């Protein structure tokens, strides 16, 4: 199938309360596998998945060193951004960066990513060509000019096409028990009277991995798209996800409604009905 690796980074400044807090996490698909918190007792990059625990002492020393270097660079970059936006030193500010790669079923690079945000909005992003930049504003243009001069895109391209993909494939093999196992949703439909005239039908999907799922309601085979309430897919805490989809139905017409469930772990797509 298709897989992804992402490293996420967040620095938050806190004037008068010491240096910025730095938190970075790594993901393969929907699985958190590493974390680093600058405020931790003695900051180390730590395993968060069982398949990464087999990487040796040298892996963890290097990762930890990279995180420490990144935290410090982020401290400098936060100070730079105050300058670029003519901001006082009074306020708390946020610097975010994500990078990583998508691979197809064959293990070849589909897309590389590297992008930054400041105070929640796009700052600069590496384009899909892994050679050109999109700067959101005139401040980001200063970074763009600096990064063009220092040929940073080339350095990122080399990693994204090379190590990112290679290590992703390695992780997928080492974690094949879980990363290459799709767990199907456990599904059921519940009924919730509103009045003598109508009721809510709620279609549940529980215990699924990965997070990608489609839940839809139909009436007589016609999709009830506008009339469906859909909660955001939410984590169960045990690597699995949950979602439900609800429709308001006229009492007595429940059997006209079908909930449809599409997920990779299922032998076949499901068609569910309210079953009293």
């Amino acid at each position: 199938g298709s897989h992804s690796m992402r490293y996420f980074h967040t620095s938050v400044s806190r004037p008068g309360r010491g240096e910025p807090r730095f938190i970075t996490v790594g993901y393969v698909d929907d699985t958190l596998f590493v974390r680093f918190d600058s405020d931790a007792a003695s900051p180390r990059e730590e395993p968060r998945a069982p398949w990464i625990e087999q990487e040796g002492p040298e892996y963890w020393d290097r990762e930890t060193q990279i995180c420490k270097a990144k935290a410090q660079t982020d401290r400098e970059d936060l100070r730079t951004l105050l300058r670029y936006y003519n901001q006082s030193e009074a306020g708390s500010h946020t610097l975010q960066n994500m990078y990583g790669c998508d691979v197809g079923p064959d293990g070849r690079l589909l897309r590389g990513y590297h992008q930054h945000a400041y105070d929640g909005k796009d700052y600069i992003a590496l384009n899909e060509d892994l050679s050109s930049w999109t700067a959101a504003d005139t401040a980001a243009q200063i970074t763009q000019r600096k990064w063009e001069a220092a040929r940073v895109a080339e350095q990122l391209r080399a990693y994204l096409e090379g190590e990112c993909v290679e290590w992703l494939r390695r992780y997928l093999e080492n974690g094949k028990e879980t990363l290459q196992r799709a767990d199907p949703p456990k599904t059921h439909v519940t009924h919730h009277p509103i009045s003598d005239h109508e009721a809510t039908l709620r279609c549940w999907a529980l215990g699924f991995y990965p997070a990608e799922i489609t839940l839809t309601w139909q009436r007589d085979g016609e999709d009830q798209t506008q009339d469906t309430e859909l909660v955001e897919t939410r984590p169960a805490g045990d690597r699995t996800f949950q979602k439900w989809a609800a429709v308001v139905v006229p009492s007595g017409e429940e059997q006209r409604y079908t909930c449809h469930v599409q997920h990779e772990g299922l032998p076949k797509p499901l068609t569910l009905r309210w079953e009293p």
Binding site: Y7, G26, Y59, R62, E63, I66, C67, A69, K70, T73, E76, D77, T80, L81, Y84, Y99, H116, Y123, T143, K146, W147, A150, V152, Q155, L156, Y159, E163, C164, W167
Partner: peptide
């Protein structure tokens, strides 16, 4: 594993 960052904003 991670990329080493060698550039600043």
């Amino acid at each position: 594993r991670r990329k080493w960052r060698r550039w600043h904003l």
